mmCIF file of N, CA and C in Angstrom:
data_model
loop_
_atom_site.group_PDB
_atom_site.id
_atom_site.type_symbol
_atom_site.label_atom_id
_atom_site.label_comp_id
_atom_site.label_asym_id
_atom_site.label_seq_id
_atom_site.Cartn_x
_atom_site.Cartn_y
_atom_site.Cartn_z
ATOM 1 N N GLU H 13 -31.979 3.463 -9.341
ATOM 2 C CA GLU H 13 -32.394 4.250 -8.144
ATOM 3 C C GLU H 13 -31.587 5.543 -8.002
ATOM 4 N N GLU H 14 -30.509 5.656 -8.775
ATOM 5 C CA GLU H 14 -29.643 6.835 -8.725
ATOM 6 C C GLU H 14 -30.324 8.065 -9.337
ATOM 7 N N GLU H 15 -31.000 7.873 -10.471
ATOM 8 C CA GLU H 15 -31.763 8.950 -11.115
ATOM 9 C C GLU H 15 -32.904 9.384 -10.202
ATOM 10 N N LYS H 16 -33.626 8.404 -9.666
ATOM 11 C CA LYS H 16 -34.753 8.681 -8.783
ATOM 12 C C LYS H 16 -34.324 9.481 -7.557
ATOM 13 N N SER H 17 -33.189 9.111 -6.963
ATOM 14 C CA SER H 17 -32.690 9.830 -5.786
ATOM 15 C C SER H 17 -32.298 11.257 -6.141
ATOM 16 N N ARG H 18 -31.623 11.415 -7.276
ATOM 17 C CA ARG H 18 -31.196 12.728 -7.714
ATOM 18 C C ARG H 18 -32.418 13.620 -7.947
ATOM 19 N N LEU H 19 -33.447 13.059 -8.577
ATOM 20 C CA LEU H 19 -34.673 13.815 -8.848
ATOM 21 C C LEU H 19 -35.441 14.090 -7.561
ATOM 22 N N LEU H 20 -35.507 13.098 -6.679
ATOM 23 C CA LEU H 20 -36.265 13.277 -5.438
ATOM 24 C C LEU H 20 -35.595 14.297 -4.528
ATOM 25 N N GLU H 21 -34.269 14.319 -4.537
ATOM 26 C CA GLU H 21 -33.525 15.319 -3.777
ATOM 27 C C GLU H 21 -33.935 16.717 -4.240
ATOM 28 N N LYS H 22 -34.024 16.912 -5.556
ATOM 29 C CA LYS H 22 -34.437 18.213 -6.093
ATOM 30 C C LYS H 22 -35.893 18.540 -5.748
ATOM 31 N N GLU H 23 -36.761 17.529 -5.775
ATOM 32 C CA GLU H 23 -38.156 17.734 -5.395
ATOM 33 C C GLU H 23 -38.246 18.176 -3.941
ATOM 34 N N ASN H 24 -37.522 17.491 -3.065
ATOM 35 C CA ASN H 24 -37.558 17.839 -1.650
ATOM 36 C C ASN H 24 -37.063 19.260 -1.414
ATOM 37 N N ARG H 25 -36.017 19.654 -2.133
ATOM 38 C CA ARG H 25 -35.501 21.014 -2.009
ATOM 39 C C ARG H 25 -36.572 22.020 -2.409
ATOM 40 N N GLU H 26 -37.305 21.711 -3.479
ATOM 41 C CA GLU H 26 -38.362 22.610 -3.944
ATOM 42 C C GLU H 26 -39.507 22.661 -2.936
ATOM 43 N N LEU H 27 -39.829 21.522 -2.331
ATOM 44 C CA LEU H 27 -40.881 21.486 -1.311
ATOM 45 C C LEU H 27 -40.477 22.321 -0.100
ATOM 46 N N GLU H 28 -39.181 22.347 0.224
ATOM 47 C CA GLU H 28 -38.709 23.179 1.337
ATOM 48 C C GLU H 28 -38.892 24.653 1.009
ATOM 49 N N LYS H 29 -38.671 25.011 -0.252
ATOM 50 C CA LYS H 29 -38.876 26.392 -0.696
ATOM 51 C C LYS H 29 -40.355 26.763 -0.593
ATOM 52 N N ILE H 30 -41.229 25.834 -0.976
ATOM 53 C CA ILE H 30 -42.673 26.047 -0.898
ATOM 54 C C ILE H 30 -43.087 26.230 0.564
ATOM 55 N N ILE H 31 -42.512 25.416 1.444
ATOM 56 C CA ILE H 31 -42.797 25.508 2.871
ATOM 57 C C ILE H 31 -42.380 26.876 3.417
ATOM 58 N N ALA H 32 -41.188 27.334 3.042
ATOM 59 C CA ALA H 32 -40.716 28.647 3.494
ATOM 60 C C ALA H 32 -41.637 29.753 2.973
ATOM 61 N N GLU H 33 -42.075 29.619 1.725
ATOM 62 C CA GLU H 33 -42.971 30.608 1.136
ATOM 63 C C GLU H 33 -44.303 30.656 1.868
ATOM 64 N N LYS H 34 -44.831 29.487 2.215
ATOM 65 C CA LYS H 34 -46.116 29.422 2.904
ATOM 66 C C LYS H 34 -46.016 29.941 4.335
ATOM 67 N N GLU H 35 -44.922 29.627 5.030
ATOM 68 C CA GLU H 35 -44.730 30.148 6.391
ATOM 69 C C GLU H 35 -44.607 31.665 6.362
ATOM 70 N N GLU H 36 -43.890 32.193 5.373
ATOM 71 C CA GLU H 36 -43.746 33.644 5.265
ATOM 72 C C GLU H 36 -45.102 34.293 4.984
ATOM 73 N N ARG H 37 -45.919 33.655 4.146
ATOM 74 C CA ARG H 37 -47.261 34.168 3.878
ATOM 75 C C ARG H 37 -48.121 34.178 5.145
ATOM 76 N N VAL H 38 -48.045 33.110 5.943
ATOM 77 C CA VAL H 38 -48.800 33.063 7.204
ATOM 78 C C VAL H 38 -48.324 34.191 8.113
ATOM 79 N N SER H 39 -47.017 34.433 8.106
ATOM 80 C CA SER H 39 -46.438 35.515 8.907
ATOM 81 C C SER H 39 -46.945 36.876 8.443
ATOM 82 N N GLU H 40 -46.997 37.069 7.125
ATOM 83 C CA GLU H 40 -47.492 38.320 6.549
ATOM 84 C C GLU H 40 -48.931 38.562 6.967
ATOM 85 N N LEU H 41 -49.732 37.497 6.960
ATOM 86 C CA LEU H 41 -51.139 37.593 7.336
ATOM 87 C C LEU H 41 -51.281 37.929 8.819
ATOM 88 N N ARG H 42 -50.418 37.350 9.643
ATOM 89 C CA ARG H 42 -50.472 37.634 11.079
ATOM 90 C C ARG H 42 -50.032 39.064 11.372
ATOM 91 N N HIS H 43 -49.109 39.584 10.567
ATOM 92 C CA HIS H 43 -48.687 40.978 10.695
ATOM 93 C C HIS H 43 -49.872 41.897 10.386
ATOM 94 N N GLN H 44 -50.735 41.457 9.473
ATOM 95 C CA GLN H 44 -51.912 42.244 9.098
ATOM 96 C C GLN H 44 -52.999 42.245 10.170
ATOM 97 N N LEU H 45 -52.974 41.260 11.067
ATOM 98 C CA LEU H 45 -53.935 41.216 12.172
ATOM 99 C C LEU H 45 -53.766 42.425 13.080
ATOM 100 N N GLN H 46 -52.513 42.768 13.372
ATOM 101 C CA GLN H 46 -52.200 43.898 14.246
ATOM 102 C C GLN H 46 -52.623 45.199 13.581
ATOM 103 N N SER H 47 -51.851 45.611 12.577
ATOM 104 C CA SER H 47 -52.102 46.851 11.849
ATOM 105 C C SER H 47 -53.420 46.798 11.081
ATOM 106 N N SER U 22 -21.345 -2.569 -1.766
ATOM 107 C CA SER U 22 -22.198 -2.051 -0.664
ATOM 108 C C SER U 22 -22.676 -0.636 -0.981
ATOM 109 N N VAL U 23 -22.093 -0.033 -2.016
ATOM 110 C CA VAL U 23 -22.569 1.265 -2.498
ATOM 111 C C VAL U 23 -23.969 1.125 -3.108
ATOM 112 N N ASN U 24 -24.316 -0.085 -3.550
ATOM 113 C CA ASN U 24 -25.644 -0.334 -4.117
ATOM 114 C C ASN U 24 -26.698 -0.293 -3.023
ATOM 115 N N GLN U 25 -26.381 -0.906 -1.886
ATOM 116 C CA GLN U 25 -27.276 -0.881 -0.734
ATOM 117 C C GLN U 25 -27.376 0.544 -0.193
ATOM 118 N N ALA U 26 -26.264 1.276 -0.242
ATOM 119 C CA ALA U 26 -26.250 2.666 0.207
ATOM 120 C C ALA U 26 -27.211 3.496 -0.631
ATOM 121 N N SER U 27 -27.201 3.267 -1.941
ATOM 122 C CA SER U 27 -28.086 4.007 -2.844
ATOM 123 C C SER U 27 -29.554 3.709 -2.553
ATOM 124 N N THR U 28 -29.843 2.454 -2.226
ATOM 125 C CA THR U 28 -31.207 2.058 -1.911
ATOM 126 C C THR U 28 -31.681 2.736 -0.634
ATOM 127 N N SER U 29 -30.808 2.779 0.368
ATOM 128 C CA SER U 29 -31.127 3.445 1.630
ATOM 129 C C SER U 29 -31.341 4.926 1.395
ATOM 130 N N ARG U 30 -30.492 5.527 0.561
ATOM 131 C CA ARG U 30 -30.626 6.954 0.264
ATOM 132 C C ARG U 30 -32.016 7.259 -0.295
ATOM 133 N N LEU U 31 -32.455 6.464 -1.267
ATOM 134 C CA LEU U 31 -33.773 6.672 -1.866
ATOM 135 C C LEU U 31 -34.891 6.530 -0.839
ATOM 136 N N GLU U 32 -34.818 5.496 -0.006
ATOM 137 C CA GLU U 32 -35.851 5.299 1.018
ATOM 138 C C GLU U 32 -35.899 6.482 1.970
ATOM 139 N N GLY U 33 -34.723 6.981 2.349
ATOM 140 C CA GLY U 33 -34.645 8.136 3.239
ATOM 141 C C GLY U 33 -35.246 9.375 2.602
ATOM 142 N N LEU U 34 -34.975 9.576 1.314
ATOM 143 C CA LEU U 34 -35.527 10.745 0.629
ATOM 144 C C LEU U 34 -37.039 10.630 0.504
ATOM 145 N N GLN U 35 -37.544 9.402 0.405
ATOM 146 C CA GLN U 35 -38.995 9.191 0.334
ATOM 147 C C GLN U 35 -39.642 9.533 1.676
ATOM 148 N N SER U 36 -38.959 9.184 2.762
ATOM 149 C CA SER U 36 -39.443 9.516 4.103
ATOM 150 C C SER U 36 -39.459 11.028 4.260
ATOM 151 N N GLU U 37 -38.383 11.674 3.825
ATOM 152 C CA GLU U 37 -38.286 13.125 3.912
ATOM 153 C C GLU U 37 -39.390 13.790 3.090
ATOM 154 N N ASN U 38 -39.645 13.250 1.901
ATOM 155 C CA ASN U 38 -40.678 13.791 1.021
ATOM 156 C C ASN U 38 -42.034 13.784 1.724
ATOM 157 N N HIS U 39 -42.348 12.688 2.409
ATOM 158 C CA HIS U 39 -43.616 12.600 3.123
ATOM 159 C C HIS U 39 -43.694 13.604 4.265
ATOM 160 N N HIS U 40 -42.601 13.738 5.010
ATOM 161 C CA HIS U 40 -42.524 14.725 6.082
ATOM 162 C C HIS U 40 -42.860 16.122 5.552
ATOM 163 N N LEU U 41 -42.249 16.483 4.428
ATOM 164 C CA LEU U 41 -42.445 17.809 3.839
ATOM 165 C C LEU U 41 -43.866 18.001 3.334
ATOM 166 N N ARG U 42 -44.433 16.959 2.744
ATOM 167 C CA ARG U 42 -45.802 17.061 2.234
ATOM 168 C C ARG U 42 -46.817 17.171 3.361
ATOM 169 N N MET U 43 -46.550 16.499 4.475
ATOM 170 C CA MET U 43 -47.422 16.608 5.642
ATOM 171 C C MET U 43 -47.344 18.019 6.218
ATOM 172 N N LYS U 44 -46.151 18.611 6.199
ATOM 173 C CA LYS U 44 -45.978 19.990 6.663
ATOM 174 C C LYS U 44 -46.758 20.952 5.782
ATOM 175 N N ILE U 45 -46.772 20.690 4.479
ATOM 176 C CA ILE U 45 -47.523 21.550 3.566
ATOM 177 C C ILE U 45 -49.018 21.470 3.847
ATOM 178 N N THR U 46 -49.515 20.270 4.131
ATOM 179 C CA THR U 46 -50.931 20.127 4.459
ATOM 180 C C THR U 46 -51.278 20.967 5.685
ATOM 181 N N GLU U 47 -50.390 20.949 6.677
ATOM 182 C CA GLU U 47 -50.576 21.745 7.894
ATOM 183 C C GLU U 47 -50.556 23.238 7.581
ATOM 184 N N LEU U 48 -49.610 23.659 6.745
ATOM 185 C CA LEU U 48 -49.505 25.076 6.390
ATOM 186 C C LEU U 48 -50.695 25.571 5.591
ATOM 187 N N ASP U 49 -51.233 24.728 4.712
ATOM 188 C CA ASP U 49 -52.406 25.131 3.948
ATOM 189 C C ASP U 49 -53.574 25.350 4.896
ATOM 190 N N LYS U 50 -53.621 24.547 5.953
ATOM 191 C CA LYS U 50 -54.656 24.694 6.966
ATOM 192 C C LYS U 50 -54.447 26.014 7.715
ATOM 193 N N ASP U 51 -53.195 26.330 8.043
ATOM 194 C CA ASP U 51 -52.887 27.573 8.754
ATOM 195 C C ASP U 51 -53.236 28.791 7.892
ATOM 196 N N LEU U 52 -52.918 28.712 6.600
ATOM 197 C CA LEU U 52 -53.219 29.796 5.670
ATOM 198 C C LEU U 52 -54.716 30.076 5.650
ATOM 199 N N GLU U 53 -55.514 29.019 5.559
ATOM 200 C CA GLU U 53 -56.961 29.188 5.536
ATOM 201 C C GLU U 53 -57.485 29.776 6.843
ATOM 202 N N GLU U 54 -57.026 29.227 7.963
ATOM 203 C CA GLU U 54 -57.513 29.663 9.275
ATOM 204 C C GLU U 54 -57.167 31.114 9.586
ATOM 205 N N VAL U 55 -55.954 31.541 9.240
ATOM 206 C CA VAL U 55 -55.560 32.933 9.458
ATOM 207 C C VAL U 55 -56.271 33.851 8.461
ATOM 208 N N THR U 56 -56.460 33.380 7.229
ATOM 209 C CA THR U 56 -57.189 34.167 6.240
ATOM 210 C C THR U 56 -58.618 34.404 6.722
ATOM 211 N N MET U 57 -59.234 33.378 7.307
ATOM 212 C CA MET U 57 -60.601 33.512 7.840
ATOM 213 C C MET U 57 -60.626 34.466 9.039
ATOM 214 N N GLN U 58 -59.588 34.396 9.866
ATOM 215 C CA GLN U 58 -59.465 35.264 11.035
ATOM 216 C C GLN U 58 -59.327 36.729 10.624
ATOM 217 N N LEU U 59 -58.549 36.964 9.572
ATOM 218 C CA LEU U 59 -58.254 38.309 9.085
ATOM 219 C C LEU U 59 -59.425 38.949 8.330
ATOM 220 N N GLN U 60 -60.172 38.135 7.595
ATOM 221 C CA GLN U 60 -61.288 38.631 6.794
ATOM 222 C C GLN U 60 -62.599 38.654 7.577
#
């Protein structure tokens, strides 16, 4: 379970990066609504 | 008891993984809805 945890920790970190990227994209799109 | 700790750690990371994946599903929905609003 040690390998699995180490790998899953890295997966979760990557998913957090994906989440930040998607939120920033939604923000970019909302900025485009105004201008 | 470090063995039980490792098992708990994995279960917790699995819970976290699901939380993050559910957030992604929500964000994909937001991306589509705002894209439709903008276009």
